[PDB]
Symmetry: D2
Subunit: 249 residues, 4 copies
């Protein structure tokens, strides 16, 4: 398929409901060789078990809060893939107290710091650590949300972090393009994943396609953006939300 | 390939340099069945000859200035494709006097009217005329340019028309989504085509990928947007300009 | 006030509810000298009454569908204001059939053409017609709506026409900036529980922002679409 | 003037070239009563001199890296202004190493953290700390730059920090709108042949727009990033 001969690292697989899971089955269907990271020991077996289904045995600890963990992870990966063709960054976090109710009351300095570090900085932190391993033609991809561009109740400081993240996409694109690397985001519509219970009160009637997008839709667009078919696209946030953001009333 | 079982009409093939030409070879490579329109008798043989290469014999006159021409064209097409899966709208025009020098001096009421009618209205005019022929899963695609969003010297009233066109993309998406049709645009970076001699003084050093996009890049993104792989994307303007618009200085 | 010294042409007064009417009051308050146009004989008396109440007797016919009507108006204005400081374009139209139901079914070639001509081309037409009359420091203003940027039901082809108008703003700001003329738009909210300010905007609110954008206070702003919609467009799922 | 009746806190004066300094002059001209903060002992005398020249003697230490410094400042302000009408946030910082060369190579976790904390979090921190002190009709303003929206060389992580700040504006406008508080930003140009107005913006131009956005004239505007950059961001390849 259209990713044959590519090697792609995939972060953030937590269950079969994860966006990262849909992106992985899609790139896998399309002929990519895959490798996987997992945040910590609680998810090691699970992620090894999801990896195994997709015929990868490359499954590595990576907590993106830690420079040493990202560095170690890429060192270990370089033993099997001294070069590869990019990564999918599918990782968000803010402490639970940040997303309950009025934004200005819930936000704290520490909550802001963690949300931005894990949801935004980690993307460029991964890029720094593997920059010399990337082939020409490589593509990096992260996931964002409409909360970057609009004030969405309860999403709160995550909206700020995703705005920081989309700006990260542009700065990374502009920096890395000259060495042959593209960097994009998918602004995904809402899907019912493990991380979405963290959000309070979690629209298909006012989406133009009249249904919510699935991890399959998101996965297919992802595969496209990490392939040579999208060689003309970098620094872009592609809305995969069924047209929701372009509608009003 | 990823358009097998799709039938797609392609307008605006004028030479081998046309964006429509790149989109057609790409959809053709990907297993689509194709049909072609041509503006008038001056391009009939040429377009039949380009069609023939791509193994289509469906080649029909269509001047989009004329409701009767669009209606006749779809009547003729319905004899061979009573149903199909969408069309590529790759058609722009403004009289030559519109694009020389200062915008407020060059623009006229008639120039404005023609630019908008041919470059913007024609897209929804085609949609009106074939609406009942479209399958569920159909996708419509037009081509726009950065001149819709920024004041670009000499591009002049075409910038207004392309802004009208991108708004057309949203209104069409929102209207047709409920019956299972998606509608998008590609905002293409500059390529050296037949229509670009019309533009005066026609940047790769400040594009992040450090080269201009080709009709191949544009064609591959096009194919994607008219395929089921992009089923989560409607009402969107995708920038295929190598990241040019997201850079400054 | 912050417009003393300025002479501003105001189009589009049709009633005391008109956006142009709120704009004119606010501009008069801030000390501008005002002149007015009226589309046709049906509105002439209303515009003359309102102009009198503001201390103006410059009240000129202008139908922006006609190049000759625009030229004749500016030749008449020239007799009393050979130079002036810009104008407010507060004009919109599409045939009523364009606004009824599903967009693709309602839009027609003629409806599209009329909507773009009246709602967008007429802004630059006015600018061509008065260009040598503009002082350095001039400011042109037009009025737009969120339907330029989102698909809003029934607003239909008026949305394309507004998107065209917002591009016209940019192209005009770019062309006329070197001669000392700024061009901007207000994207006004409709004149409520999901609006951040928790109320709809009024023609007073619109008027005050329009006065600003036509004054030397806004000298740093050109080519800009300013949202005066209470925060509505930046909120989602409130 | 159009700010008479208003009491506005101004942060970020460091010199007569500071954006905050142009803002304060313009606000004083339009009749506002002013109060000032200063980051540290190095800037205290400059801020006191300037405040004296404007007829103010409210000059309070505030380092926005510290929650305690922000709380203590607002407790001191409360002794003379138990209620007030909003504040201008004119504060930006990243370690100098963040701004040197290729973005990906210069950015570090600590640099990123400091840039976002000082340049974005501190806007809402101030708002939490004074929220019950704000009158209905209040207006918060912050300052941003085009590097929030485009990749500009060397501006590097300050661009992410500004994008965060512009989202903070929206989220804040949404949260505080129901209590009668507006929140906006100015995206200022750098303080020229491809700028539509054919000159860079001045701190006077910025000041006048900031005075507007903090006055009841802008009552219809909230959650908005207004570009005061002479049209620069809407032009291409001039
Ligand atoms: N599900 C939706 O509706 C939706 C919509 C738009 C965007 N997104 C985004 O898509 C991405 C994937 O989210 P999801 O819904 O698939 O959720 P998920 O809960 O399946 O995935 C979140 C993942 O991030 C990982 N992660 C968190 N902290 C980490 C750390 N310190 N180190 C390493 N990994 C860490 C978790 O272990 C988990 O694998 C996120 O960026 C989320 O914001 C989700
Ligand atoms: N080439 C570029 O750099 C570039 C960049 C961005 C967008 N675009 C857009 O892409 C599209 C294709 O342009 P191109 O550069 O491939 O040019 P081209 O000159 O090869 O194609 C323009 C086509 O439009 C057709 N057309 C014009 N008037 C017509 C009418 N009345 N009826 C039917 N067809 C009509 C012409 O016959 C021709 O086939 C246009 O919308 C153009 O604005 C071009
Ligand atoms: N009312 C709202 O909620 C709202 C919101 C956003 C934008 N707008 C825009 O504000 C502007 C003013 O609208 P309004 O609500 O004040 O409506 P209104 O009907 O009071 O004013 C419309 C005006 O346009 C004039 N006009 C129409 N065709 C014309 C022609 N051929 N020549 C000259 N004048 C012509 C009419 O005479 C009338 O004065 C319009 O551009 C409208 O699109 C309205
Ligand atoms: N100067 C320009 O061309 C330009 C253009 C666009 C935006 N901006 C923005 O305008 C704002 C003001 O910048 P400026 O050009 O006036 O610079 P300036 O250096 O005069 O002002 C920066 C101010 O930030 C203050 N500051 C830094 N860290 C702080 C802390 N911990 N606590 C409290 N105060 C702190 C400094 O004391 C200083 O007063 C900034 O947000 C800057 O990003 C500047
Ligand atoms: N990853 C992740 C995640 C963590 C927190 Br805490 C909050 C939301 C998260 O993902 C989302 C889930 C759902 C939506 Cl709509 C957006 C998201 O960014
Ligand atoms: N199609 C077409 C076309 C017609 C005119 Br007249 C002007 C430009 C045209 O296409 C473009 C060529 C080049 C660029 Cl960069 C943009 C365009 O829209
Ligand atoms: N003027 C005007 C106008 C004409 C038509 Br037909 C449709 C709408 C018009 O004005 C508006 C009224 C209300 C809103 Cl919300 C937006 C508008 O553009
Ligand atoms: N304040 C401030 C500031 C601090 C750093 Br470090 C970098 C830039 C800063 O201000 C600016 C100066 C100039 C411009 Cl163009 C934009 C700015 O944000």
């Amino acid at each position: 398929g259209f990713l044959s001969g590519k090697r792609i690292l995939v972060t953030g697989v937590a269950s079969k409901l994860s966006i990262a899971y849909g992106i992985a089955q899609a790139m896998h269907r399309e002929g990519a060789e895959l490798a996987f990271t997992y945040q910590n020991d609680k998810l090691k077996g699970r992620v090894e078990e999801f990896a195994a289904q997709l015929g990868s045995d490359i499954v590595l600890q990576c907590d993106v809060a830690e420079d040493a963990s990202i560095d170690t992870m890429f060192a270990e990966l370089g033993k099997v893939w001294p070069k590869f063709d990019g990564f999918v960054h599918s990782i968000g976090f803010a402490p639970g107290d940040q997303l309950d109710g009025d934004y200005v009351n819930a936000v704290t300095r520490e909550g802001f710091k963690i949300a931005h570090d894990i949801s935004s900085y980690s993307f460029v932190a991964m890029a720094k650590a593997c920059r010399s391993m990337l082939n020409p033609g490589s593509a990096l991809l992260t996931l964002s949300y409409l909360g970057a561009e609009r004030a969405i109740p309860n999403y709160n400081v995550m909206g700020l972090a995703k705005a920081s993240l989309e700006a990260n996409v542009r700065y990374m694109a502009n920096a890395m393009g000259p060495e042959g690397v593209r960097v994009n985001a998918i602004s995904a519509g809402p899907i019912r994943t493990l991380a979405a219970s963290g959000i309070k009160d979690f629209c298909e009637a006012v989406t133009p396609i009249r249904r919510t997008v699935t991890i399959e839709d998101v996965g297919n667009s992802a595969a496209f953006l990490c392939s040579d078919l999208s060689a003309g696209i970098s620094g872009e946030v592609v809305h995969v939300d069924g047209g929701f953001s372009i509608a009003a009333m």
